[PDB]
């Protein structure tokens, strides 16, 4: 039985390749010769088609302004995942590009508050992302940020972004996503730097297990680092909700850091 979101591969035109990944490619194209779309292609053998269709039933129920809207799916290998096209691409690309030097703390916190908003909806909908990182956040015009690839990680493991209980025991919850968000905050405040710079995956897992946490990034206020440390609490239940995170980040420059003033890069 054909899924409502299942479409023929023929109805798609793969016009411009936007990037290359480990498991596939990302293209800019057209669907039914009228809609500009983004197409994530997956190499055959990288994902089970049946498992993806079952997981896509949950994603169909998820409708939010800060979530990338899923349009269509091609269930036959190579699997094609069709969404709305986002003007500036990945948040990591945007931070590591020409724009990243002009982004200050107000713009970065605004983007974080938008990601927290998308994730607070995921939280309320009793869902889990599993791969919350800058690379999986899409940017458009007016710093519009949208959470992408929700629940696809389960179907190159990002040790640096994963909570210890999830990386070591497979305990993937909304609280492990909160840990990942704290790591995402580190990517924003350092403007696209890799977490725990200079440390290999084994050193990270060994140090974080011993209680190590990334220090306050240069010229980042202690209050924002304190929030990162709240996301990085050892006990998953002690970590803040995304609902709390969104509110804290939305109100940041009034209720928390009104003494904020621009520095060299923040
Ligand atoms: C990499 C890239 N993507 C662009 N736009 C994009 N819009 C959407 C994209 C995108 O990544 N789409 C996408 C589609 C389906 C996916 O699958 C799932 C989604 C949700 C749940 C489960 C699976 C995953 C991802 S990519 C634009 C772009 N540009 C335009 C801006 N240029 C200059 C810099 O601003 C650089 C090239 N570069």
Q: What is the CATH number of the domain that holds 56?
A: 3.30.200.20
Asked if the structure places residue 81 within a domain, the reply is: yes
β-partners of residue 37 are 29, 84
Q: Which two tokens stand for residue 229?
A: 């440390």
Question: From atom 35 of ligand 1, which residue's Cα is the shortest distance away?
Answer: 88
Same domain for 93 and 63:
no
Question: From atom 28 of ligand 1, which residue's Cα is the shortest distance away?
Answer: 89
Between the CA of residue 176 and those of 109, 161, 201, 224, 239, what are the distances in Å?
21, 9, 18, 19, 9
Name which of 256, 68, 243 is nearest 145 in CA terms.
68
Same domain for 122 and 92:
yes
User: What is the sign, positive or negative, of the torsion defined by CA atoms of 21, 25, 27, 32?
Assistant: negative
Instruction: Answer whether 121's CB lies under 8 Å from 174's CB.
Output: no
Residues in the chain preceding a C-to-N separation beyond 2.5 angstroms (breaks) = 155
Instruction: Answer whether 105's CB lies under 8 Å from 266's CB.
Output: yes
Same domain for 226 and 161:
yes
Please give the residue range of the domain that contains residue 48. Answer: 1-85
Q: Give how many domains the chain has, as a whole number.
A: 2
Alpha-carbon span 31 to 208, nearest angstrom: 45
Instruction: Answer whether 181's CB lies under 8 Å from 189's CB.
Output: no
Token pair 């480990």 in the structure block, residue:
22
User: What is the sign, positive or negative, of the torsion defined by CA atoms of 167, 169, 174, 176?
Assistant: negative
Instruction: Answer whether 207's CB lies under 8 Å from 199's CB.
Output: yes
Same domain for 141 and 72:
no
Q: How many residues does the chain have?
A: 266
Name which of 203, 129, 191 is nearest 160 in CA terms.
203
DSSP the chain: ---TTB--GGGEEEEEEEEE-SSEEEEEEEETTTEEEEEEEE-TTSS-HHHHHHHHHHHTT---TTBPPEEEEE-SSSEEEEEE--TTEEHHHHHHSSGGGT--HHHHHHHHHHHHHHHHHHHHTT---S--SGGGEEE-GGG-EEE-STT-TT----TTTS-HHHHHH----HHHHHHHHHHHHHHHHTTSPPSSTT--HHHHHHHHHTT----PPTT--HHHHHHHHHHT-SSGGGSPPHHHHHHHHHHIIIII-TT----S--
What's the resolution in A? Answer: 2.5
- Which residues does ligand 1 sit against, CB inside 6 Å? 18-19, 26, 38, 40, 59, 68, 70, 81, 83, 85-86, 88-90, 93, 97, 138, 148-150, 152
């Amino acid at each position: 039985a054909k899924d409502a979101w299942e479409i023929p591969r023929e109805s798609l035109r793969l016009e411009v390749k936007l990037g290359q990944g480990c498991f596939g490619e990302v293209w800019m194209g057209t669907w039914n010769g009228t809609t500009r779309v983004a197409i994530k292609t997956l190499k055959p053998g990288t994902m089970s088609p049946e498992a993806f269709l079952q997981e896509a039933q949950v994603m169909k129920k998820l409708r939010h302004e800060k979530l990338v809207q899923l349009y269509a799916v091609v269930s036959e290998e190579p699997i094609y995942i069709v969404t709305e096209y986002m003007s500036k691409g990945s948040l990591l690309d945007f931070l590591k590009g020409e724009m990243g030097k002009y982004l200050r703390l107000p713009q970065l916190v605004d983007m974080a508050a938008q990601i927290a908003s998308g994730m607070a909806y995921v939280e309320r909908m009793n869902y889990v992302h599993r791969d919350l990182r800058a690379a999986n956040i899409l940017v458009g015009e007016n710093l519009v940020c949208k959470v992408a690839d929700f629940g696809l990680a389960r179907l190159k493991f990002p040790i640096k972004w994963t909570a210890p209980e999830a990386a070591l025991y497979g305990r993937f919850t909304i609280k492990s996503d909160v840990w990942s968000f704290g790591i995402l905050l580190t990517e924003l405040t350092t403007k696209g730097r890799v977490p725990y710079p200079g440390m290999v995956n084994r050193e990270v897992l060994d140090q974080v297990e011993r209680g190590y946490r990334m220090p306050c990034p240069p010229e980042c206020p202690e209050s924002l680092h304190d929030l990162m440390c709240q996301c990085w609490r050892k006990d998953p239940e002690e970590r803040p909700t995304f609902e709390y995170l969104q509110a804290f980040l939305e109100d940041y420059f009034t209720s928390t850091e009104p003494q904020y003033q621009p520095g060299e890069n923040l």
